[PDB]
Amino acid sequence: LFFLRMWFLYGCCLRFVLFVLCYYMSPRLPSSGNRRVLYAVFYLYNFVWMLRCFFCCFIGLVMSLFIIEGGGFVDLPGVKYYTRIVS
Amino acid sequence: REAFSNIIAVDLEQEGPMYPVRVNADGVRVLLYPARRIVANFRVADIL
Amino acid sequence: RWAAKFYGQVTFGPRNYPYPSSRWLARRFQMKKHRIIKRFRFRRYKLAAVANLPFAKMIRVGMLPELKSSKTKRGDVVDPTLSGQLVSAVKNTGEKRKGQRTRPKSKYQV
Amino acid sequence: IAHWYCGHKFRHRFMRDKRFHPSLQASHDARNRFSKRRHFKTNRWNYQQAYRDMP
Amino acid sequence: PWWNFQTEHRQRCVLMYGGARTKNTHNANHRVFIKKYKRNAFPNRTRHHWAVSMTGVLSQRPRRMPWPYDLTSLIFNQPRQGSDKIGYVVGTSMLKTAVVATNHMVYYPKFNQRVSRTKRFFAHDEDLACVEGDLVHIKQCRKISKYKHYYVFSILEPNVEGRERLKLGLKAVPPPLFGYPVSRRIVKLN
Amino acid sequence: HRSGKARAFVFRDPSLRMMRAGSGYQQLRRMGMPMQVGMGWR
RNA sequence: AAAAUUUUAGGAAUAGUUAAUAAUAAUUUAUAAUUUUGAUUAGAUUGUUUUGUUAAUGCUAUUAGAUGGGUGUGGAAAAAUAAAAAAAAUAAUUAAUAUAUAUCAAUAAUAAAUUAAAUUAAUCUAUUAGUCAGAAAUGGAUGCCAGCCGUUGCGGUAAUUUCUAUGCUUUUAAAUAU
RNA sequence: UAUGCAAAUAUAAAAUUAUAGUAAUUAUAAAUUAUAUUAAAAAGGUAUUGUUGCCCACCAAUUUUUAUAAUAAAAAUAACGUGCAGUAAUUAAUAUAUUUAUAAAAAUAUAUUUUUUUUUUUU
Ligand SMILES: [Mg+2]
Ligand SMILES: [Mg+2]
Ligand SMILES: [Mg+2]
Ligand SMILES: [Mg+2]
Ligand SMILES: [Mg+2]
Ligand SMILES: [Mg+2]
Ligand SMILES: [Mg+2]
Ligand SMILES: [Mg+2]
Ligand SMILES: [Mg+2]
Ligand SMILES: [Mg+2]
Ligand SMILES: [Mg+2]
Ligand SMILES: [Mg+2]
Ligand SMILES: [Mg+2]
Ligand SMILES: [Mg+2]
Ligand SMILES: [Mg+2]
Ligand SMILES: [Mg+2]
Ligand SMILES: [Mg+2]
């Protein structure tokens, strides 16, 4: 188990975040493609943290806040958090 | 035929080990101890 | 010695490997050590430890406003008397006075 | 070993446990266990004439 | 009922037959450390706190617990723990006051072994017999001054060398050569 | 693996594991060693 | 009045201050006291019968409740909402029921599927997963793309690993995340 | 070439990297590789249908953590341009030391084989 990947869950299983950016990043070879990465924000003890996580979710009509869960590893190095649903 | 060359037998007068056997195969440390019943990994279990 | 012999763990091989380090690993870490040392030389690092001061905390003299290499970065704040004395030390270290013991010289020491 | 105590690695836990080990405790022989090196070579240049009131 | 499985539960209000009525405190919480400071500037001179700190006393691993059984309880029958102590006299700078260093015992049940720690006490000797380096018996008593609850009950071993040393006008014991350690380098020559 | 945990060559005799446990914390609590200085369970 | 047990990866000095005198001394007397056997500041933290795992010396929890003085009442300060303690005439015991609020607790999918409830019939209409490896597959798209990812890894026109449709698989309080 | 300063492999340790938050690991040794003057016979591989094999630093973009030193440090990384450092590898490599510098690195002083061996029991 790798315990430092969970740094921004802060001892919680799931997180609530707000959408900011959505950009694309290329995974580690030999896997080619475009991985969609959402750049999100949330606040804890009046500090505003920018969270960076893998967008696997389904976007419908335009919506703002997501639910973040931690997984195993993914093709893309450096992105620990995954998306459950969008609200 | 390699398995029939290596055949082992066991004295069943006692039906299980009466003391702990602590022995390692290459890099694999094994403990064979007396129990009330058979407890082991499924494979180890039907080997025993 | 003050400085570090190694950087990172240079002896990592399997147990009972009958040498301190393998060739491969030692070459990797020789690379990293090389880069760090080269950085020290070109940026012209200078450290000092003064008597009757906390020793673990070393005044970095290479960042002092007079001896600073960069024209841009704000260097450091060290006492005026002490900093004068440090400047004098660095300066009068440079050249060999006869009767004194010969000590290794370099471009990057100035 | 709970992962939140001490460092992020495991071995940091056992490195702070060696601080509490029974046979490792500080005494008249083993001293300054936690910082040995800040106090090293501290009195080298401190010249102290030893105390003699008897001839 | 703590011996019943997750699925076996029916009522949460009572123990049907007997056993221990147990509240489950949730031991695995994934509690975390919040990092509020830069690694450069931490607001303490001697120590730095970078992780979750273990808390409690006796709840502290590895457990270190009071050991009643040692030399002192071996020799004495004490009405109250710490009512008797045997120690050495270290220093007399205070009138009618003898400082005494004493050993007591700690037990680590994890490793199954004991350690001796040491502690200083102020003891009250009226009449000023005690010379530095005496082996003394010491007892609990009436509160005397802010820090003195102990009085010198008996001198087990006096210091004969120290007394004769005093009689000649010299200090009982030579003053220690170096004081406490420092983090500086003192250059003092001649 | 110079950097990593020490492993036993064989197992440990379980019987001995149970014999060295005689003075352990649970047995002490049963003997009554620790002083009860607080309310404890209700 | 005391004695024990006291945390921070990389560690330095602390201070209305010790002890004697005495119902003394904002300037009594003294070679004072705490600290590297880890102090004081500073971080975190509600302290010495409560938990979880385990064959087991262990590891891993345990809330909560005592925050200075200043007309000093009172046996004792515990004295400024927040009960569920009958409080100087037997208020009442045919009582345990309290409607819709809260705080931190308090484990409900209670024969989860065929013969019926020795009732008083009151609350509820209750579902998920997989389908390469390893129980279980075929069409159709897609073509290093889109996407899958517990993990080795998969995707290069034939993909038993993507998406979709349909079946099929499960040892039946769910998958997934921490 | 040991009168100033200078603790330091000879091991007390809990998966690799990393100044103790970065990536998800790393390290490793006997299979296999055609030419070294015997009356043809001894040999190495960081590759793995194996030298048209792999790899090394600087030199751009970006991503992310922070203890911001010419131009911060570290980690992900698949461009462009230099070369050819390494696999006994075109002056063998490895470690410490000191110097040097487009970049791998190079010169010297010591130890040493994770380099291949060549062998006078008084002539
Ligand atoms: Mg955590
Ligand atoms: Mg993967
Ligand atoms: Mg070098
Ligand atoms: Mg000369
Ligand atoms: Mg008030
Ligand atoms: Mg199958
Ligand atoms: Mg899927
Ligand atoms: Mg097609
Ligand atoms: Mg198909
Ligand atoms: Mg950055
Ligand atoms: Mg950088
Ligand atoms: Mg080359
Ligand atoms: Mg070379
Ligand atoms: Mg070469
Ligand atoms: Mg070299
Ligand atoms: Mg060069
Ligand atoms: Mg070199």
Side-chain angles (χ1 to χ4, degrees):
Chain A
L1 291 94
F2 313 94
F3 297 123
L4 288 169
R5 293 175 68 78
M6 265 45 262
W7 180 282
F8 296 105
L9 295 181
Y10 286 106
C12 200
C13 54
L14 275 66
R15 218 57 176 177
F16 263 101
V17 290
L18 289 177
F19 176 89
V20 183
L21 293 177
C22 215
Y23 55 97
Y24 295 101
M25 190 91 62
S26 48
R28 195 199 312 258
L29 291 182
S31 280
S32 56
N34 310 322
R35 301 289 174 261
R36 198 191 281 101
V37 169
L38 90 104
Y39 193 84
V41 54
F42 78 129
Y43 95 101
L44 162 133
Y45 290 168
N46 64 61
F47 282 1
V48 159
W49 299 118
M50 308 306 306
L51 192 63
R52 164 183 181 270
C53 78
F54 186 75
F55 191 114
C56 35
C57 198
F58 161 71
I59 190 63
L61 67 87
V62 278
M63 291 163 305
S64 174
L65 48 106
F66 304 86
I67 305 184
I68 286 330
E69 107 201 337
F73 287 88
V74 73
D75 292 326
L76 183 47
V79 50
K80 308 96 150 52
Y81 305 102
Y82 306 93
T83 303
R84 246 166 189 253
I85 79 153
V86 53
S87 297
Chain B
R1 68 174 59 97
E2 184 65 37
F4 272 124
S5 297
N6 292 342
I7 276 227
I8 330 178
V10 165
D11 196 13
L12 289 190
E13 270 177 1
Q14 305 315 318
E15 295 174 357
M18 289 293 99
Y19 64 105
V21 173
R22 288 150 30 242
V23 143
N24 82 311
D26 64 327
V28 175
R29 296 84 215 265
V30 178
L31 175 73
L32 176 68
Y33 63 93
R36 183 171 27 244
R37 37 179 276 245
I38 281 229
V39 345
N41 184 224
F42 182 80
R43 189 160 280 151
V44 186
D46 58 333
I47 290 180
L48 292 180
Chain C
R1 57 152 74 197
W2 281 16
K5 206 163 188 180
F6 289 135
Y7 294 75
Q9 162 186 211
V10 200
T11 77
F12 176 58
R15 254 161 192 147
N16 277 335
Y17 186 80
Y19 292 97
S21 48
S22 84
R23 294 286 181 96
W24 178 243
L25 244 205
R27 202 168 292 122
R28 315 268 307 280
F29 285 108
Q30 179 63 36
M31 185 54 199
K32 136 181 243 196
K33 172 189 235 193
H34 169 69
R35 297 183 63 265
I36 295 165
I37 298 306
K38 186 167 133 176
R39 166 164 74 243
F40 287 176
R41 280 172 162 274
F42 282 145
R43 276 103 178 263
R44 302 199 289 105
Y45 277 30
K46 291 150 197 170
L47 295 182
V50 175
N52 57 67
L53 275 189
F55 235 58
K57 173 62 70 174
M58 282 164 191
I59 311 155
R60 28 187 205 180
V61 187
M63 292 245 62
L64 226 50
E66 293 76 356
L67 281 57
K68 193 204 300 193
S69 296
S70 96
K71 265 68 179 295
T72 325
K73 262 89 60 177
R74 78 290 158 246
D76 258 328
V77 185
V78 183
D79 298 333
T81 298
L82 200 142
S83 91
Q85 293 178 359
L86 292 183
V87 165
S88 54
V90 186
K91 186 54 201 76
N92 293 128
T93 295
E95 71 111 12
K96 169 179 179 69
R97 191 175 292 88
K98 177 159 151 167
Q100 301 298 290
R101 24 197 277 195
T102 305
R103 187 95 188 132
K105 291 174 193 177
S106 51
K107 305 185 166 191
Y108 305 105
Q109 185 183 339
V110 174
Chain D
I1 304 310
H3 71 274
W4 39 83
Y5 292 131
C6 332
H8 62 285
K9 291 299 190 181
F10 271 161
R11 66 158 148 263
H12 301 152
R13 176 74 184 282
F14 301 105
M15 258 199 273
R16 73 71 92 170
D17 281 350
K18 258 178 189 170
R19 148 188 210 104
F20 296 107
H21 196 77
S23 45
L24 296 186
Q25 283 315 310
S27 58
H28 50 262
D29 27 30
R31 305 200 33 236
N32 294 41
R33 0 171 36 204
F34 305 139
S35 64
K36 190 156 157 281
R37 291 272 97 79
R38 297 280 167 281
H39 311 112
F40 182 67
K41 272 171 124 85
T42 290
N43 287 317
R44 276 257 285 204
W45 298 270
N46 182 12
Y47 286 178
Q48 289 296 306
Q49 301 301 308
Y51 173 88
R52 58 175 88 278
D53 47 0
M54 282 194 82
Chain E
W2 63 268
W3 59 93
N4 280 147
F5 284 108
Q6 167 181 7
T7 331
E8 202 178 12
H9 287 147
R10 293 304 181 253
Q11 43 79 28
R12 53 262 227 127
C13 279
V14 84
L15 263 40
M16 288 298 312
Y17 202 54
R21 179 50 191 264
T22 261
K23 170 187 185 310
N24 182 326
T25 149
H26 312 276
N27 47 305
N29 281 352
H30 195 180
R31 53 179 171 137
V32 294
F33 165 90
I34 312 303
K35 176 204 178 194
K36 297 189 292 287
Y37 295 99
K38 298 262 147 212
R39 217 70 157 64
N40 254 335
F42 183 90
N44 183 24
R45 238 188 174 183
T46 73
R47 250 165 146 329
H48 303 260
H49 166 243
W50 297 115
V52 172
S53 197
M54 185 179 331
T55 56
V57 42
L58 247 88
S59 181
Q60 281 243 186
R61 279 96 53 177
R63 282 197 173 76
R64 334 181 247 290
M65 39 194 309
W67 211 233
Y69 326 95
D70 62 66
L71 171 68
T72 316
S73 76
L74 205 21
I75 288 168
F76 295 114
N77 191 333
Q78 311 170 357
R80 170 196 308 154
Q81 273 173 40
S83 68
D84 302 318
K85 291 192 178 311
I86 289 181
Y88 273 98
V89 177
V90 189
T92 313
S93 286
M94 314 131 83
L95 269 187
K96 308 158 179 294
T97 285
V99 205
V100 178
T102 299
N103 293 321
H104 60 281
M105 221 109 297
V106 184
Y107 178 75
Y108 295 77
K110 170 179 189 181
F111 313 99
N112 188 28
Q113 70 171 309
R114 277 99 62 205
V115 193
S116 86
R117 294 175 180 197
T118 203
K119 177 84 187 210
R120 294 160 61 87
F121 289 107
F122 295 172
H124 181 80
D125 64 328
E126 192 66 14
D127 109 324
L128 295 161
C130 310
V131 195
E132 311 188 348
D134 289 336
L135 185 74
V136 295
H137 180 6
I138 252 186
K139 279 196 184 188
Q140 266 201 353
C141 70
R142 192 193 79 202
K143 167 60 80 178
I144 296 179
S145 79
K146 190 167 170 170
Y147 297 110
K148 305 168 62 185
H149 2 286
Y150 282 96
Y151 71 108
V152 176
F153 184 79
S154 68
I155 317 284
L156 264 62
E157 151 90 15
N159 196 27
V160 261
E161 164 51 37
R163 264 168 173 279
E164 253 62 21
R165 201 155 147 61
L166 275 177
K167 174 176 178 53
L168 270 65
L170 319 173
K171 309 185 56 192
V173 217
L177 168 62
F178 289 119
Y180 270 88
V182 291
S183 310
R184 331 192 163 276
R185 305 261 264 253
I186 309 95
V187 184
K188 177 255 177 303
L189 308 169
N190 99 107
Chain F
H1 205 128
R2 297 184 165 154
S3 224
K5 188 167 166 282
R7 190 178 189 177
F9 182 67
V10 300
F11 254 101
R12 293 194 169 209
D13 206 319
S15 36
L16 254 187
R17 189 84 65 106
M18 238 209 60
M19 282 307 109
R20 285 193 265 261
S23 296
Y25 190 66
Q26 295 301 308
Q27 291 74 30
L28 291 195
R29 283 180 64 234
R30 268 189 263 117
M31 282 144 48
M33 296 285 320
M35 200 105 69
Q36 176 199 357
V37 85
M39 293 260 64
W41 69 71
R42 299 181 64 165

